[PDB]
């Protein structure tokens, strides 16, 4: 099974799979082939949890199910600059307008 | 050109509806007309007494959306092997993301209304352009021209 | 794999495997044509260019696979944007 995932920070989402049995360090080195920052330097998380690097996706709860290819799970990730890391921050995107009258 | 073949062959089918749609089973008669037979509920299956070298194509009951059966327009019975029925596969195909929001906003808006979406001319006469049976049959004549 | 940055009006980098968004011809000329794997879109605001990156993904998986092929979900506040992203993006 292959898993569906945007990887966020700020105002980046990264588009990627991986399998459901790889390991959140597995994709920390995808992560940093792409924005080239070592795992060690990176923070993966579920919702406002700190996964850890040996937990297969599975485990950490990136399913199938749940990561779909047109509906992919969210993981946050945050930089260490040179040290204490920072606090996670995936910026929000933009705001549908009000649906027309047509529609509503 | 696009008619079933009175082989007379008796060919049992499962018709299976692998969508989310109201599935309406198309058969193509002996003189190219295109008969509507009962519907599918989504996720269910029929088994249909069918024929060899009949001609069947799928669509959604409520929109006549195209669909796929065995990841392909038409559906032609074949022999059963060990009296085995053939299995037809009903999907959904991987629409463009262009149809598939002409889809959504036909399902939301009055076709009255499509003239009042503030939408260029050429996607009005996109959105008014609903699927309908024949002209894929026409255009997949030509396809084979 | 190489992958290209595909910047919303916004500004959101979206980051999506080359091959994906080859998916759409005019991305294709934006890419060969008139930074060498960005692309910034002054019309698609970011949620409606992350849509369109989540279908690319769908169609590569779920084109010519035998496995049942799931509906593409698309909320109704954001069908009309995307309506004319997708016409403008031939995909
Ligand atoms: C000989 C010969 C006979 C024929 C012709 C004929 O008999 N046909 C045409 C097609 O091959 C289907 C078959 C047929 N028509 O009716 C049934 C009994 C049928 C009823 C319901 C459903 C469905 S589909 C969805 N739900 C159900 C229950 C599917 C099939 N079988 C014509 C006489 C119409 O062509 N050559």
Redesign the interface.
């Not at chain 3, 916004?10 to 495997?17: P, R, S, T, Y």
């Not at chain 3, 909320?75 to 944007?81: C, D, K, Q, T, W």
């Given at each position: 099974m292959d898993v569906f995932l945007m990887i966020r920070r700020h105002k980046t989402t990264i588009f990627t799979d991986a399998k459901e049995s790889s390991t959140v360090f597995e994709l920390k080195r995808i992560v940093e082939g792409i924005l080239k920052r070592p795992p060690d330097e990176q923070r993966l998380y579920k919702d406002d949890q700190l996964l850890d690097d040996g937990k297969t996706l599975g485990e950490c709860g990136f399913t199938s199910q749940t990561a779909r290819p047109q509906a992919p799970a969210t993981v946050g990730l945050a930089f260490r600059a040179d040290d204490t890391f920072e606090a996670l921050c995936i910026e929000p995107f933009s705001s549908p307008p009000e649906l027309p009258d047509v529609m509503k | 050109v696009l008619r079933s073949v009175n082989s007379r062959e008796p060919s049992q089918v499962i018709f299976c509806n692998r969508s989310p749609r109201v599935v309406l089973p198309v058969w193509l008669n002996f003189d190219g007309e295109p008969q509507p037979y009962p519907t599918l509920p989504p996720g269910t299956g029929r088994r249909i007494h069918s024929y060899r070298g009949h001609l069947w194509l799928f669509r959604d009951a409520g929109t006549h959306d195209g669909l796929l059966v065995n990841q392909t327009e038409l559906f032609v019975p074949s022999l059963n092997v060990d009296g085995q029925p053939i299995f037809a596969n009903i999907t959904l195909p991987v629409y463009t993301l262009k149809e598939r929001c002409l889809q959504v906003v036909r399902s939301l808006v009055k076709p009255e209304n499509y003239r009042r979406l503030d939408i260029v001319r050429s996607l009005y006469e996109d959105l008014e352009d609903h699927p309908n049976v024949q002209k894929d049959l026409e255009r997949l004549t030509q396809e084979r021209i | 794999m190489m992958?290209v940055k595909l910047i919303?009006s916004?500004?959101?980098?979206?980051?999506?495997?080359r091959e994906?968004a080859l998916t759409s011809g005019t991305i294709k000329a934006m890419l060969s044509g008139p930074e060498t794997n960005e692309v910034n879109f002054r019309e698609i605001?970011?949620?409606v260019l992350?849509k369109?990156?989540?279908?690319?993904?769908?169609?590569?998986?779920?084109?010519?696979s035998?496995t049942?092929?799931?509906?593409?979900?698309?909320?109704?506040?954001?069908?009309?944007?995307?309506?004319?992203?997708?016409?403008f993006?031939?995909?």
């Open positions: - | - | 992958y919303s916004d500004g959101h980098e979206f980051i999506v495997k994906h605001p970011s949620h992350s369109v990156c989540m279908y690319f993904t769908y169609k590569v998986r779920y084109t010519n035998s049942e092929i799931p509906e593409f979900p698309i909320a109704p506040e954001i069908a009309l944007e995307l309506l004319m992203a997708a016409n993006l031939d995909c």
